[PDB]
Amino acid sequence: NVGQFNLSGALGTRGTFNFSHFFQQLGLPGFQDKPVVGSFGFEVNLQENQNALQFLSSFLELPEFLLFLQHAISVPEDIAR
């Protein structure tokens, strides 16, 4: 839902980040159901950011990730804090 901006029931607009300015730069209506500048003067590519969100969503479904987590828990803090 973050990738598709289906956020009306999860996000309000009172916060200090300016969503109207963000969506105006992107040419988008807002919450559904030139260099673009986002937070802190970072240049934002929406398609790359949406691909990154899709990557994490599938990354969290891999059965290999649970095995990675199990093995990574055992790595000593002396070599990886």
Partner 1 sequence: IMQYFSNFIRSGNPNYPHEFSRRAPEFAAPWPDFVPRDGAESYKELSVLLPNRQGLKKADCSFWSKYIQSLKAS
Ligand X SMILES: *[C@@H]1O[C@H](CO)[C@@H](O)[C@H](O)[C@H]1NC(C)=O
Per CB under 8 A, residues contacting partner 1 are: 64, 67, 73-74
CA proximity to 43, closest of 18, 22, 27, 20: 22
Do the Cβ atoms of 4 and 32 come closer than 8 Å? yes
Distance CA 35, CA 42 (A): 10
User: Which residues from 21-40 bind ligand X, rule CB under 6 A?
Assistant: 21
18 binds, among partner 1, ligand X, none (CB under 5 to 8 A by kind): ligand X
Distance CA 19, CA 31 (A): 9
64 binds, among ligand X, partner 1, none (CB under 5 to 8 A by kind): partner 1
Q: Select from 9, 10, 15, 20 the one that contacts ligand X (CB under 6 A).
A: 20
Distance CA 49, CA 54 (A): 9
Closer residue to ligand X in complex, CB, 22/46: 22
Least distance in Å: CB of 53 to partner 1? Answer: 24
